[PDB]
Coordinates of C-alpha atoms in Angstrom, one line a residue:
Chain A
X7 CA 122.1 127.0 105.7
X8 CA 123.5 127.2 102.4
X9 CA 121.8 124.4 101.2
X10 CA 118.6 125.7 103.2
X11 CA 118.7 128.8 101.0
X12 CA 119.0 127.2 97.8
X13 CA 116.5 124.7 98.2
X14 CA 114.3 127.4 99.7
X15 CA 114.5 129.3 96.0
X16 CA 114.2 126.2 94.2
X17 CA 111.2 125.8 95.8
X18 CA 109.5 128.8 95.1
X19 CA 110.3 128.9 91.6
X20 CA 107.2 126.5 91.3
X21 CA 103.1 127.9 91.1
X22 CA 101.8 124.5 92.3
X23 CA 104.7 124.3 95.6
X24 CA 103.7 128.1 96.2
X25 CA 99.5 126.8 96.0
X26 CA 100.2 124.5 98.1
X27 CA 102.5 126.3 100.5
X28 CA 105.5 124.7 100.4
X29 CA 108.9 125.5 102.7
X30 CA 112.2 123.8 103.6
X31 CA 112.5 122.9 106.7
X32 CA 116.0 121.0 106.7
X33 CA 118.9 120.8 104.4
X34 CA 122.4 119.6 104.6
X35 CA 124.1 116.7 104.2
X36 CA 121.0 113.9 105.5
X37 CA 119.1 115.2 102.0
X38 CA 116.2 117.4 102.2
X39 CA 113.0 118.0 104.8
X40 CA 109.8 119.4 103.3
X41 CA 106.6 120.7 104.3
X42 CA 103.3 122.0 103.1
X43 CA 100.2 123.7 104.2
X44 CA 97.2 122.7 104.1
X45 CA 93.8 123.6 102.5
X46 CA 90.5 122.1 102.1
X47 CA 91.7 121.5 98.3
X48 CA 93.4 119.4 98.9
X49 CA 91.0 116.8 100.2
X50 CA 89.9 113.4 98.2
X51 CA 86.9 112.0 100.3
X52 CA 85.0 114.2 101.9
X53 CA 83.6 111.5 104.2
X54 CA 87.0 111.0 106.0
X55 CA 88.3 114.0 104.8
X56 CA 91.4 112.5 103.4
X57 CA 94.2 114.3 101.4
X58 CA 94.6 113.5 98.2
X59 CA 97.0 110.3 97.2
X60 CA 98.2 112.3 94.4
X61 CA 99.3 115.4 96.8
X62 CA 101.3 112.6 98.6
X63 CA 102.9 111.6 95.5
X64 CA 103.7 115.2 94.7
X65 CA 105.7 115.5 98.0
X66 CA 107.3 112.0 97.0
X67 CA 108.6 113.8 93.4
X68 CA 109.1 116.8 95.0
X69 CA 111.7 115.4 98.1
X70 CA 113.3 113.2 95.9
X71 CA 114.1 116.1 93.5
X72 CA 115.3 118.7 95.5
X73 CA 117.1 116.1 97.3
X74 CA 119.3 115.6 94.2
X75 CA 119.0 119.1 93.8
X76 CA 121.4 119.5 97.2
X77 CA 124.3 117.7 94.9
X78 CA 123.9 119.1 92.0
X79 CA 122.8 122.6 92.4
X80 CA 119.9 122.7 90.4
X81 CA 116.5 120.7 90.2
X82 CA 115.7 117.3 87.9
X83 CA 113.4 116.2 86.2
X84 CA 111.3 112.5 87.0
X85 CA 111.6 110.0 84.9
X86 CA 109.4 107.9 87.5
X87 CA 108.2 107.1 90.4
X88 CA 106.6 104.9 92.6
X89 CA 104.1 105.4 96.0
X90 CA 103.4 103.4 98.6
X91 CA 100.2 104.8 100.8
X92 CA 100.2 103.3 104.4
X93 CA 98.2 105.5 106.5
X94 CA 95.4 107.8 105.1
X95 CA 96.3 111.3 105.7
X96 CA 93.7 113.6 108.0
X97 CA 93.6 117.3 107.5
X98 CA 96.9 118.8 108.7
X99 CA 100.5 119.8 107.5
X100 CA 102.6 117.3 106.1
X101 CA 106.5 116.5 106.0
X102 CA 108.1 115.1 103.4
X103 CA 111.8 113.3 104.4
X104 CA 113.8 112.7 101.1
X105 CA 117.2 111.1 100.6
X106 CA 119.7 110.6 97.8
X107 CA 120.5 106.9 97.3
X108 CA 122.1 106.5 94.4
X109 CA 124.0 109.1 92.4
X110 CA 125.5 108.5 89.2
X111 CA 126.8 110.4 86.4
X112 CA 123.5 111.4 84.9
X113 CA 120.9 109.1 87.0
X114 CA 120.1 109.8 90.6
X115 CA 117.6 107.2 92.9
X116 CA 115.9 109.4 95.8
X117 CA 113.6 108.0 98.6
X118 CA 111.1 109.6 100.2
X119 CA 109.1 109.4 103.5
X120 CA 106.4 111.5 103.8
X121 CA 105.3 112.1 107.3
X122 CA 101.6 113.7 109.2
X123 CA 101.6 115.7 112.4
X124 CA 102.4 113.6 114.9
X125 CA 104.9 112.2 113.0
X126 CA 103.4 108.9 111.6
X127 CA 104.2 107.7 108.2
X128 CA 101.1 108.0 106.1
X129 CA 103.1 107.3 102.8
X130 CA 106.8 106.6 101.1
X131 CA 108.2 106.1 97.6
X132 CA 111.2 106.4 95.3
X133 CA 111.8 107.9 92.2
X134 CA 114.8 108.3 89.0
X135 CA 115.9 111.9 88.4
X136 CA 117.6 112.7 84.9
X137 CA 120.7 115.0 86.1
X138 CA 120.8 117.7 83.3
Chain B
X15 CA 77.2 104.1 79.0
X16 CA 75.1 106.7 80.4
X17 CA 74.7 104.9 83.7
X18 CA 78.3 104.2 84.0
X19 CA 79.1 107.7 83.1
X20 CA 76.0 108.9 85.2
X21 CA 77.9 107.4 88.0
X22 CA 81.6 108.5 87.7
X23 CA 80.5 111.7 87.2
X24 CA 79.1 111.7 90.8
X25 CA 81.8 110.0 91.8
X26 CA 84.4 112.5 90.5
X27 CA 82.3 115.2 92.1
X28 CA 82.7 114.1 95.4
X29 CA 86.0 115.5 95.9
X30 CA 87.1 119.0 96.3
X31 CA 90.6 118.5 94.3
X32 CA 89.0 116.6 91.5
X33 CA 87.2 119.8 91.4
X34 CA 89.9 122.5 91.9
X35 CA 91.4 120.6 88.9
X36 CA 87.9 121.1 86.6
X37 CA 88.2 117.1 86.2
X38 CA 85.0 115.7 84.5
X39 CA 84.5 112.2 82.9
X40 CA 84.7 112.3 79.3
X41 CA 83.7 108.3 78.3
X42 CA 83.0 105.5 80.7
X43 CA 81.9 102.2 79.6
X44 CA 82.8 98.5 79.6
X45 CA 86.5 99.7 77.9
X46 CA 87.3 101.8 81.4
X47 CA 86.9 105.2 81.9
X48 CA 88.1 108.6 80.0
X49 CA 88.8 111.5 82.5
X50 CA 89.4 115.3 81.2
X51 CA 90.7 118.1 83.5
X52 CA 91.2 122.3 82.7
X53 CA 95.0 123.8 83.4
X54 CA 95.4 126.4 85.2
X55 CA 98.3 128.5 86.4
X56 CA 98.8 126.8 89.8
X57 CA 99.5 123.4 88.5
X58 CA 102.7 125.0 86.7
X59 CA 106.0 122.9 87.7
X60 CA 109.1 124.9 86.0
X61 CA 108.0 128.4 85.5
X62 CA 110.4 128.5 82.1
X63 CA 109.3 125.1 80.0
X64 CA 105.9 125.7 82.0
X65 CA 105.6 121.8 82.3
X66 CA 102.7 120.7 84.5
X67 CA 103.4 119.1 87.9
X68 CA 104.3 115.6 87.8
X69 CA 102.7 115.2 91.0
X70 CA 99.6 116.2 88.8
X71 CA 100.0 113.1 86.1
X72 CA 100.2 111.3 89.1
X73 CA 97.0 112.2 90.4
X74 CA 95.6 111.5 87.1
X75 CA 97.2 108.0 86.9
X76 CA 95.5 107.3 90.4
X77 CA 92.0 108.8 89.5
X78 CA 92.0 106.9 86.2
X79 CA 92.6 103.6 87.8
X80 CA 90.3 104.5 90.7
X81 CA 87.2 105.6 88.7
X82 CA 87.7 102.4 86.4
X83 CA 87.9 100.1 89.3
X84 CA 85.0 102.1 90.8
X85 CA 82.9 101.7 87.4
X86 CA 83.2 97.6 88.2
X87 CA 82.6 97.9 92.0
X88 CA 80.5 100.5 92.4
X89 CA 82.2 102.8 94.7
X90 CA 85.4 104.7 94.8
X91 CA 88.5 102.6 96.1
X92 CA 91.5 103.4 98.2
X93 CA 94.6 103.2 96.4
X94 CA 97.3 101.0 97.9
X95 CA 100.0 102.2 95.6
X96 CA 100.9 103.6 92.7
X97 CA 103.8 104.2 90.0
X98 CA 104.3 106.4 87.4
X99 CA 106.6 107.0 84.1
X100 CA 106.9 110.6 82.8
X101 CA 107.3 110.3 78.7
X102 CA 107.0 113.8 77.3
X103 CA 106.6 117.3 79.4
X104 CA 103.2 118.5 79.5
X105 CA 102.8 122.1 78.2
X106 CA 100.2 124.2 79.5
X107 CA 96.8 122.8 77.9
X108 CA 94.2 120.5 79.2
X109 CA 94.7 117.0 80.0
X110 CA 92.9 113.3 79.5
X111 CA 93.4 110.3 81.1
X112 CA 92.5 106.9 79.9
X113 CA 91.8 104.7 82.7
X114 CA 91.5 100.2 82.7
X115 CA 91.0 97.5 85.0
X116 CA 93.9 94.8 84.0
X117 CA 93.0 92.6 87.1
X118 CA 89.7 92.2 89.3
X119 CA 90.0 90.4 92.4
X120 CA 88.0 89.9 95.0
X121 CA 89.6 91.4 97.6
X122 CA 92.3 93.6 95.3
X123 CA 92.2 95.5 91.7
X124 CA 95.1 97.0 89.7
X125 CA 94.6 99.0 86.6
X126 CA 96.7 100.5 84.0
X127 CA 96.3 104.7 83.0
X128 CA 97.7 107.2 80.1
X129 CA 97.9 110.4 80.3
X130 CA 97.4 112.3 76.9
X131 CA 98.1 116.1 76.2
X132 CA 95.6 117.7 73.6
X133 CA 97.0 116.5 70.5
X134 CA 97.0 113.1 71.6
X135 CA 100.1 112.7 72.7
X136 CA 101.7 110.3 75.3
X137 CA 102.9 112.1 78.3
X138 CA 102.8 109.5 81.1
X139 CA 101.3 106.5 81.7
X140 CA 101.3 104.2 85.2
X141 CA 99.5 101.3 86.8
X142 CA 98.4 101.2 90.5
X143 CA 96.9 98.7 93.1
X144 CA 93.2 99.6 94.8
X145 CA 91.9 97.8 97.9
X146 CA 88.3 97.1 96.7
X147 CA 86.3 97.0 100.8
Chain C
X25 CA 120.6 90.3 115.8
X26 CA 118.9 87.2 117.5
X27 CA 120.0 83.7 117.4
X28 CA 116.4 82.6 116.8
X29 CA 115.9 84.9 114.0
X30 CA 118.9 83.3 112.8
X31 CA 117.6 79.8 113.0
X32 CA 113.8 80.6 112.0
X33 CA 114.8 82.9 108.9
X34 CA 117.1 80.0 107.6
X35 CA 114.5 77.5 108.0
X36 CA 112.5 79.7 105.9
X37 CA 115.1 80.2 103.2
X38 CA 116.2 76.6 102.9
X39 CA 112.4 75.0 102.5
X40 CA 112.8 77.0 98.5
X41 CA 114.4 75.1 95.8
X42 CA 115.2 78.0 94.3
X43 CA 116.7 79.6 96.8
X44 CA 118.6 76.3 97.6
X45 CA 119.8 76.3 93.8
X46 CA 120.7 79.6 94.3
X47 CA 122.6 78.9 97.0
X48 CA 121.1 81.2 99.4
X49 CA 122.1 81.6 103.1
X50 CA 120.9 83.8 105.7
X51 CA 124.0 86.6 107.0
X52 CA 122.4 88.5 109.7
X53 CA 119.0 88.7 111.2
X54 CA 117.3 90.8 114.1
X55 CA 115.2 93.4 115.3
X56 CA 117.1 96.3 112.2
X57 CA 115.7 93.4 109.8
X58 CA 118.0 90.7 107.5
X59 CA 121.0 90.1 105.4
X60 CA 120.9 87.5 102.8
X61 CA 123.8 85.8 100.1
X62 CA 123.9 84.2 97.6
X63 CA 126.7 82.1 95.5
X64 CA 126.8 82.8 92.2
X65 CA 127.1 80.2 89.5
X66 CA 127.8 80.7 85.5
X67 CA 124.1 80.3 84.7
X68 CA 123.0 83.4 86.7
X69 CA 124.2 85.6 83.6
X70 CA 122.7 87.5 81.0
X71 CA 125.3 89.1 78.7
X72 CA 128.2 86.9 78.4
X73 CA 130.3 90.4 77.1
X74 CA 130.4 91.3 80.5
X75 CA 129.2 88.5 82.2
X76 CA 126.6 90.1 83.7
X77 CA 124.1 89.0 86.5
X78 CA 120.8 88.7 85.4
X79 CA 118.2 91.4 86.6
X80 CA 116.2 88.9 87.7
X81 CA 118.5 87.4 89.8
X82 CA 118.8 90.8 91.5
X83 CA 114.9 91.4 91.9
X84 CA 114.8 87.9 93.3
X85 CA 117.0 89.3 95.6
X86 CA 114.9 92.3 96.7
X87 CA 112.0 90.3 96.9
X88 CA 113.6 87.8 98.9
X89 CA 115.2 90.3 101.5
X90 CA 111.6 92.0 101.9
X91 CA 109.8 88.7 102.3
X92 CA 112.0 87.2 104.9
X93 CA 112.6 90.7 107.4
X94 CA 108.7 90.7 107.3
X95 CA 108.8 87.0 108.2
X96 CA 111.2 87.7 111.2
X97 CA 107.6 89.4 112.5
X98 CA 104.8 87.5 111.4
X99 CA 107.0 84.1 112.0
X100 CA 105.9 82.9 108.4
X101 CA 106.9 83.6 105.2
X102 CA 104.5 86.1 103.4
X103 CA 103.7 86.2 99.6
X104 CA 104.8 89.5 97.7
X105 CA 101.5 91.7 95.7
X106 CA 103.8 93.8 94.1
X107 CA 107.9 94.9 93.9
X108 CA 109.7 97.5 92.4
X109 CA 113.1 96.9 91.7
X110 CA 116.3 99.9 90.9
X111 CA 118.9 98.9 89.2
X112 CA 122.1 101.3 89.7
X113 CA 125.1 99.1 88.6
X114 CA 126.2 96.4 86.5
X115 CA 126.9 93.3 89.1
X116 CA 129.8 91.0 87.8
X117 CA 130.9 87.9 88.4
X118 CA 130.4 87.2 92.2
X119 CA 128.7 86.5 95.1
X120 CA 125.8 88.9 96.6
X121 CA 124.2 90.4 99.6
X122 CA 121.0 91.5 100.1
X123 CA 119.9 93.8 103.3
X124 CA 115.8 93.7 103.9
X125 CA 114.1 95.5 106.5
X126 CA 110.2 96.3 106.9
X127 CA 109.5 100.1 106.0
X128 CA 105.5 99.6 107.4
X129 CA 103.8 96.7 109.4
X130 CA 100.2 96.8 109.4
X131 CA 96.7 94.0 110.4
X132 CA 96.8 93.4 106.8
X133 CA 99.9 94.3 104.9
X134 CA 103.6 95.3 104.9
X135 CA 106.0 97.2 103.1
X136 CA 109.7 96.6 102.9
X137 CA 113.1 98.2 101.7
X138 CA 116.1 96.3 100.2
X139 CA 119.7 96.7 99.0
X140 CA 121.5 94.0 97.1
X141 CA 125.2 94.4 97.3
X142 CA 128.7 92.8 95.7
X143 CA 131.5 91.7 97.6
X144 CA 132.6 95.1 97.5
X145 CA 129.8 97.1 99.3
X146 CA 128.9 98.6 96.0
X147 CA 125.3 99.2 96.0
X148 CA 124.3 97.4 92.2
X149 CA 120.0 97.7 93.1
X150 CA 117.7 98.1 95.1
X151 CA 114.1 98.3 95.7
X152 CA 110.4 97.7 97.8
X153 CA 107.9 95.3 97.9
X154 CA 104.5 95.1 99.1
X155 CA 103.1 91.8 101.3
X156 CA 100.3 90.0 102.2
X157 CA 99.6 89.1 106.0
X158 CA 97.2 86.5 106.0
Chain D
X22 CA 109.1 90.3 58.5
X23 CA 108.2 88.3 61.3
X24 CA 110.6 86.2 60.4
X25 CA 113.8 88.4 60.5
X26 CA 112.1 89.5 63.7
X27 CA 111.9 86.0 65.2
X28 CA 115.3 84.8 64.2
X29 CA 116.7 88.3 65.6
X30 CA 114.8 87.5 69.0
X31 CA 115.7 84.3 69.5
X32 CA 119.3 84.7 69.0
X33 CA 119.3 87.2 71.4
X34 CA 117.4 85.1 74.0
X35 CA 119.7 82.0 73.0
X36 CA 122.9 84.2 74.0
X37 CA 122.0 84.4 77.7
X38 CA 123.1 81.4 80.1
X39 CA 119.7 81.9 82.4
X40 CA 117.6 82.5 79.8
X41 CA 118.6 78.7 78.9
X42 CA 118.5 77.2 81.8
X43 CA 114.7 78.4 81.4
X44 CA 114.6 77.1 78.3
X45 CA 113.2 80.2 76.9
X46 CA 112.1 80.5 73.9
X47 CA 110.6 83.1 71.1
X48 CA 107.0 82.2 70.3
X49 CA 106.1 85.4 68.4
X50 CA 107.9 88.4 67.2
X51 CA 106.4 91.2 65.0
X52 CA 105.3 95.0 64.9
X53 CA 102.9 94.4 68.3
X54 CA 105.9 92.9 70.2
X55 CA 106.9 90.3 71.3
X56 CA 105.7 86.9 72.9
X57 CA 107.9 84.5 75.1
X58 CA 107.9 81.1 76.4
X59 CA 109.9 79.4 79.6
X60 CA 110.2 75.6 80.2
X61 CA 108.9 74.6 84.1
X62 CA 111.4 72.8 86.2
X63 CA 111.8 71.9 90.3
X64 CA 114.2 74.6 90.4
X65 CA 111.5 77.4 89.7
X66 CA 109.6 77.0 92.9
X67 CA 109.2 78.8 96.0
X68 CA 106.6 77.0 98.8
X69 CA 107.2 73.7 98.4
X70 CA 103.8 72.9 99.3
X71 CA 101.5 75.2 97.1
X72 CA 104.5 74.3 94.4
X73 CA 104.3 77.9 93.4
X74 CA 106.5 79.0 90.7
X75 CA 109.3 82.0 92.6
X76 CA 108.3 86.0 92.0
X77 CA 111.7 86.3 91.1
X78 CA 111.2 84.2 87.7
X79 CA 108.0 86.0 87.1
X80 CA 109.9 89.0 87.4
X81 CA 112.8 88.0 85.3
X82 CA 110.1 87.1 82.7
X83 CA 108.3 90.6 82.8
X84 CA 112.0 92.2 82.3
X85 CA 113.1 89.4 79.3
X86 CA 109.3 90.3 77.1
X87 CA 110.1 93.9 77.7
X88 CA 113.4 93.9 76.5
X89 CA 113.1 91.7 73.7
X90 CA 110.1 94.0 72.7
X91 CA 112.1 97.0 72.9
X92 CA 115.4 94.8 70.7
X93 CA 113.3 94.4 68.3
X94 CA 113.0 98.3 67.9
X95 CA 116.7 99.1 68.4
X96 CA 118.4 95.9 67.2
X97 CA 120.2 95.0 70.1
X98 CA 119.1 93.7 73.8
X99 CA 119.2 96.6 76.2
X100 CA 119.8 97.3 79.9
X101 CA 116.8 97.8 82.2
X102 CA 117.1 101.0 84.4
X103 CA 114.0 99.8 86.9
X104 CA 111.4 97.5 86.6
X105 CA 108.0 97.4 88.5
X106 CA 105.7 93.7 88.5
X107 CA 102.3 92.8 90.2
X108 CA 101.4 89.4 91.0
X109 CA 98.2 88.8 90.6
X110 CA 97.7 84.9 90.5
X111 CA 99.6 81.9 91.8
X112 CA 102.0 80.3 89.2
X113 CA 101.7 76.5 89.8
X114 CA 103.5 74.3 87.7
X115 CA 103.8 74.7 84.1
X116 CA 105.2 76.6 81.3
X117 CA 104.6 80.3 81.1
X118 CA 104.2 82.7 78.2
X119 CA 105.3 86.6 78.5
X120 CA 103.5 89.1 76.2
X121 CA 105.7 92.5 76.2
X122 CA 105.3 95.7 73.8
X123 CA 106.8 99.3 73.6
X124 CA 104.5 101.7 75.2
X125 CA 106.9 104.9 74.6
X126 CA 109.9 104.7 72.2
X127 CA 112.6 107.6 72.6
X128 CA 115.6 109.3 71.6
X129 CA 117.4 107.7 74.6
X130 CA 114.8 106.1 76.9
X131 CA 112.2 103.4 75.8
X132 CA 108.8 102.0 78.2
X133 CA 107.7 98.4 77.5
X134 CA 104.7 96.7 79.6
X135 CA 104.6 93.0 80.2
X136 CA 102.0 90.3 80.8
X137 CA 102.9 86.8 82.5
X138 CA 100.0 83.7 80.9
X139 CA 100.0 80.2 82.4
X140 CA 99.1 77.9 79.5
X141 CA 95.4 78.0 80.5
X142 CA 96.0 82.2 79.7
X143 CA 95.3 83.3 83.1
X144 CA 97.4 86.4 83.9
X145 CA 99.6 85.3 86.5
X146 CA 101.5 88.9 86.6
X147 CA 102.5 92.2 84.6
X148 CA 104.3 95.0 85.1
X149 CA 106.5 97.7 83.3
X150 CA 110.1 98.5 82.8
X151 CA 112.1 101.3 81.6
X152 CA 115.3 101.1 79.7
X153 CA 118.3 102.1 78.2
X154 CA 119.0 102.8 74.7
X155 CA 122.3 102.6 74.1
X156 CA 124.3 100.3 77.2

């Protein structure tokens, strides 16, 4: 609620999460739970109509940050991150699940699941924040 | 050459993102591919440094490696994975993206990408693995 | 969990000489996925200031965890196409765990988690792995 | 030159306990990087009946080059904050050789990639690694 509200404006701060219509959908103590609109941008193959593997990664950076951003009050930046695509990803809204797992002094480790419609896992990844 | 350039363009084409981004290919040839793309406002990540979206190096890690497995194969390829290191922020300016095929399977690929920012700086590079079918 | 994971699982771990130098033992396994250990010996470090585990050890351990929870499904041991391993934490002189459990199970492939532990619980890596079903 | 360079890398190599029970060595050691040799034994391997050599010392080799590559920057070994390797090629018996060079050199952070030879030179694995400068 709290953490719902600040994740909300640390959201919107962001062009690109506003383009591609990003809210908060969870926050507390479980990390953070995204989601996005979509648009036919967005697509990669036209043939299976398939959202972009890079949009996927975006949600991947972006629930791992605010994630961290839930301890310490302010968003991170990536120092990297990896993706893992599982299922392709056919036009519709998208969830992305992230969670703190490691949270040092000035390094944080977030994972991310990033979820379709019906609520199969279409990708996941982790990433290493710089806490600044 | 022109035929392998001929052919990522029309590749690259394909997709409506690719296109939202203004992405055209800028070299192709036996040493990989070279992929440009324009900025614009929407791909802003902090509105104050005005640092492009990582997620948007990322796409350019995965379309480097794609389009120069896709040069060898002949088609565009599904990506499997991907990761990516962030080295410098990305100011607002256009972007390239140097794209090569470190290992061709038969049934797998993985290639290596860098990201450059107009003066020819470093400001990520990744690798990625692509399911050739 | 089961007592035939259990016995299939160790089977799997003990056919490795590496694992056997290692002295690797399966802790738990079952349906949530496995628990491995290992014994630690005086040649697993790398700095001898803080005798130090070797990161290589502990992505050995990652790849290990991820390998064997997807073999709890398949009923074979699968080889690894890529890993990514975190490290979080120095891990000193001591005996480790690792936890594995499969994160997607596909025809073709699958992806797992792990988390490689000291004798403490402290968390000192961990990381994901994609294999090959063949 | 690479000489200071080589002497510098192999006493760091020579200080580790596992890096000797590989019997690693330093092959080359200059401006490029870095280039690093392991000694085979029946320890190394994983399936018993393909007598492949374990991921793990693959990995451990991708992490070593890259390190080693970014020492001879700094001046001292450094810690690896995460570490990435494909395998692209079954490691059968024999020595291997890792190739590793600094992609991106910073005020705190450095980016080496590695490449994993079998002594025919077919790329067995590579990957990348981020580290630490400073401990």
């Amino acid at each position: 609620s709290t953490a719902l509200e600040m994740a909300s404006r640390f959201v919107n701060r962001s062009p690109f999460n506003r383009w591609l219509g990003m809210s908060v959908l969870e926050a507390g103590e479980q990390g953070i739970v995204l989601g996005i609109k979509w648009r036919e941008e967005l697509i990669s193959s036209p043939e299976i109509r398939s959202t972009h593997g890079g949009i996927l990664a975006t949600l991947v950076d972006a629930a791992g940050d605010y994630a961290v951003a839930l301890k310490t009050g302010h968003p991170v930046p990536t120092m990297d991150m990896h993706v893992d695509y599982h299922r392709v990803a056919t036009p519709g809204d998208l969830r992305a699940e992230g969670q703190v797992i490691h949270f040092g002094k000035r390094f944080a480790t977030a994972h991310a699941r990033v979820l379709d419609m019906d609520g199969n896992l279409v990708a996941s990844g982790r990433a290493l924040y710089l806490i600044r």
